Amino acid sequence: EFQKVVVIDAKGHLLGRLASVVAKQLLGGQKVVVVRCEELNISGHFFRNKLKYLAYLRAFHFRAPSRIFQKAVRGMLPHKTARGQAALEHLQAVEGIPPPFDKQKRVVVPAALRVLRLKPGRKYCTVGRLSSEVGWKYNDIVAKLEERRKVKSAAFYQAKLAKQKKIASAKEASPVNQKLSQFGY
Amino acid sequence: LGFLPRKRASRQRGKVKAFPKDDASKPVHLTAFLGYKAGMTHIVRDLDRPGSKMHKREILEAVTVIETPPMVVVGVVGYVETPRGLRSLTTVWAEHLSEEVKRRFYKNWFKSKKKAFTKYAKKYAESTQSINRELERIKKYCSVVRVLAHTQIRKTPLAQKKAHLMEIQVNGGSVADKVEWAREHFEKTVDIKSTFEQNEMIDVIGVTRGKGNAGYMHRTQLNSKIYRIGAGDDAKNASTDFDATEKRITPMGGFVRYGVVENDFVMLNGATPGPVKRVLTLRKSLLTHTSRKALEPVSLKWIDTASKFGHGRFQT
RNA sequence: ACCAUCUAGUAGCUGGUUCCUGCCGAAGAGCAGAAACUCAGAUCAGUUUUAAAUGAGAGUUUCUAGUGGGCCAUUACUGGCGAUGCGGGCCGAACGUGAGGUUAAGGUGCCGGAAUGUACGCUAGAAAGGUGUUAGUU
RNA sequence: UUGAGAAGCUCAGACGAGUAGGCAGGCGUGGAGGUUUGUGACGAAGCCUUGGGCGUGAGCCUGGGUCGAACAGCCUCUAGUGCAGAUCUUGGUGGAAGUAGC
RNA sequence: GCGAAACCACAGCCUGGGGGCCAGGUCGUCGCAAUGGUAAUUCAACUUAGUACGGAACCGUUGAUUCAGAUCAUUGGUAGAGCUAUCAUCUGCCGGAUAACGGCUGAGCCAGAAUCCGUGCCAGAGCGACGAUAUGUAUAAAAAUAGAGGUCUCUCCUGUAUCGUAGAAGAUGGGCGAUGGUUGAUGAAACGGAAGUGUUUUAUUGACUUGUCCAUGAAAUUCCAGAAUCCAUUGCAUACGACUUUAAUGUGGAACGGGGUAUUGUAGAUUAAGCCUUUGUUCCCAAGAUUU
């Protein structure tokens, strides 16, 4: 099932797997937005990606986690062609969750999840912490904003669940739900 | 290098890259002073300090005069902290404005129909609830409050009648305290002498003096020793502990290319980048220095008011 | 020195040498054709068995053009390059114009067409040292 | 059954790189003879054309515009017959450039 | 004003691999900071201390060396002003993470360098605030896979789920049961600041209602398609642009008339020129042109 706009929570996803999934979607005409890019995970110890980046530091050197992921997708696209540049403009990778996107459903990619792809006990790095060490200086405020949004969203879920309780109780109250329940619904 | 590459500062005001670290525990105040680089004088400062080689030695060094006194403090500007940087949440000044501020907000004030903040002043006065609602939003949303403050270019003696507006953030104080201080200082004239006495090392900044085919580059004089506030309006601008006699900081018969500052100056022992009448950017130190030499104040014994242009020794 | 003929002086040489399609086609005495004859009731073969199998119709006299370089690789030989484009990146494959099907080599995370297939395993990767690791021998 | 341009028509199967080199068939130009009861001031030739068509091609046919006096197909004859280049010859025209410069 | 010539396949961003091949690199004001650069260095003396053990070291203090950035009060130079002088003066830091190396438990932590990254300083490419002027586009908790949520108990093991889904592309009526549901337009009040441009509560008004059951119509589409600038003016600026000013009926500015101011100098003249300043005077004033 495909639609025009998807929001992907990047927490617990591997950088390469998620970018490759994202890149294939973009070339298919699907507008993709990736949020919480600083919770992205990378296989290997912290120093390994750290020496990878400082080698890259030794071209514009960008430190933000959202633009770290954007570079990963960019190498997986035909950027030299008008088709690739069109696809890239369809991708909006952001850190944290902007308010326009926190009120919408967020899907996850099972083929890219770290839990389903990394053996337990394997060391893994986080893009947010790696970026914060190479020059990024906004993880304090991003983390603080995350708590406020998480608190507000948690209250919304409680309100949604409380409203759900009434209809859930009224479901079995009506005898129609049990009159012809043989249909499987 | 650090200062390299050379580039003259286009803005006359010395836009400060950073400001002193605000803390809500400290009282709501400011950390800037709008100087004007009036002139200089050999304010002999008796460095009364045991152990020091120059013990009680009158330091007849250049007290770089920088006209800095009552500057129009219009209002405040909200500043919310965002993941993409610091964003200005709002900008709510006071209802009362000035012709100099209006002249600054435009380029042909006399040619213009003086429409600068025409309905805005009416909205600020009549629709005070909307201003209060925006102020309430600023106090509840903005992380920092940039207290808007113009200058007295038209008020003080100067050809330029465009008030140098400065978004001087409220140094210290809580959100309510900063708003209350801004409300108290609404449509007021922030005095640099009131902000600081300029009797010790300061963090004066600003562009240099334009030499010709260079200069006028934004600089920051770290630990800029300030002798005393050169109150040009008062006859005792250069009057000191030993000099006294209501000495004028300006040279006898007017300072070279600057005359006598109509208001208080920021006369500082040492150098200060900027030519005569060139607006300075004196400010408080971003960091803290508890050095004994900085802590120990050099007693300003005598000063120089000689008609330097001419008889460089005729004090009277 | 100049001027006019001789003079279109002397060429192993330099540079150039004008439409199309088709067919055959090297070399790098031999190799390629044309006529004439003699022909499955004829002899042959870059082949193999033995001390016949299998494929192919076999030849001749005559003339008449072109060439008698070198390079690469395995073991002087052998191929390949050279007159040869196409798929992959040496391997594969000998090419009229197309439709469809299927493949070789190489591939199927994305760029990139194609399984982020299934299953079993080890942990930078495509002379000896290590109190680093995993399976075994004495 | 009409399907002999017997140089015609018809059936089948295989095959298709190509330098030197060999063989064959064709396209084009100037002039010659014959021929088309050929074309032409109701417009020849030439030239222009995002108009159309035919041939694998060399090329040919054509609509429209321009033009104003001659031209072509077919069968043979003939040759000063086909160009992208020769630091080719002649003429024309560029960028350099309104530059160097007076 | 006149005016060539040689030359010219074609053209002009770097790295690597085999100069084009392959793979990469409306105006104006006040602010934000992606990114790039970066800076401080060394020595001496005193106090420690003639102490610890003949003779230190920690800390602190006073100063100097080199370098960097500024300034002309004073002094010198330059012919008063301006310029300028390691010939003059001022200024030039603290956080994190580390190496070697030493520890803690027994990998994960601590201590740890003129090292590295930040604070600060310099430049500001992308942006903020403010002033005047498309086929039903459905679905919002957090964290873990060697555990969470809800009330000692229960659930997860994907959304193949949930909400909406019949109508001449959605017509025209009647009955039964509840105060429903979907909305369009007004009127509001509460919430949303990270890019809040959206969430509710509603008070009405105008509709539909398939909640249920009946009554008419569809057809021959007879098999898919009001400012800115120029002119003028300011000198905080200046090779020219640009900048700071004013500059478009009043501290209006511009000029002088000057005064003050000083120089040289033997009091005088210049008398601000980048000395000040004017109860002094006159002149003129978007005045036009031009762009939005």
Curated annotation (Swiss-Prot), chain A:
Keyword Nucleotide-binding part of the UniProt annotation: no
Subcellular location: Cytoplasm
Entry's Gene Ontology molecular function annotations: mRNA binding; structural constituent of ribosome
Stated role: Component of the ribosome, a large ribonucleoprotein complex responsible for the synthesis of proteins in the cell. The small ribosomal subunit (SSU) binds messenger RNAs (mRNAs) and translates the encoded message by selecting cognate aminoacyl-transfer RNA (tRNA) molecules. The large subunit (LSU) contains the ribosomal catalytic site termed the peptidyl transferase center (PTC), which catalyzes the formation of peptide bonds, thereby polymerizing the amino acids delivered by tRNAs into a polypeptide chain.
SUPFAM superfamilies: Ribosomal protein L13 (SSF52161)
GO cellular component, one term: cytosolic large ribosomal subunit
Keyword line: Cytoplasm, Phosphoprotein, Ribonucleoprotein, Ribosomal protein
Misc. comment: There are 3 genes for uL13 in S.pombe.
Subunit structure: Component of the large ribosomal subunit (LSU). Mature yeast ribosomes consist of a small (40S) and a large (60S) subunit. The 40S small subunit contains 1 molecule of ribosomal RNA (18S rRNA) and at least 33 different proteins. The large 60S subunit contains 3 rRNA molecules (25S, 5.8S and 5S rRNA) and at least 46 different proteins.
Keyword Ribonucleoprotein recorded: yes
Gene that this polypeptide is encoded by: rpl1601
Protein name: Large ribosomal subunit protein uL13B
Single GO BP term: negative regulation of translation
Intrachain disulfide bonds: none
One Pfam family of this chain: Ribosomal_L13
InterPro entries linked to this entry: Ribosomal_uL13, Ribosomal_uL13_CS, Ribosomal_uL13_euk/arc, Ribosomal_uL13_sf
Modified residues (Phosphoserine): 181
Entry's family note: Belongs to the universal ribosomal protein uL13 family.
Curated annotation (Swiss-Prot), chain B:
BP-aspect Gene Ontology terms: cytoplasmic translation; translation
Localization terms from the record: Cytoplasm
Modified residues (Phosphothreonine): 316
Location, primary (coarse class): cytoplasm
Residues modified as Phosphoserine: 52, 127, 130, 194, 239, 299
Self-association and partners: Component of the large ribosomal subunit (LSU). Mature yeast ribosomes consist of a small (40S) and a large (60S) subunit. The 40S small subunit contains 1 molecule of ribosomal RNA (18S rRNA) and at least 33 different proteins. The large 60S subunit contains 3 rRNA molecules (25S, 5.8S and 5S rRNA) and at least 46 different proteins. uL3 forms together with ES39L one of the contact sites for the signal recognition particle that targets ribosomes to the endoplasmic reticulum membrane.
Additional free-text comment from the UniProt record: There are 2 genes for uL3 in S.pombe.
Similarity-based family: Belongs to the universal ribosomal protein uL3 family.
Protein name, UniProt field: Large ribosomal subunit protein uL3A
Species of provenance: Schizosaccharomyces pombe (strain 972 / ATCC 24843) (Fission yeast)
The encoding gene: rpl301
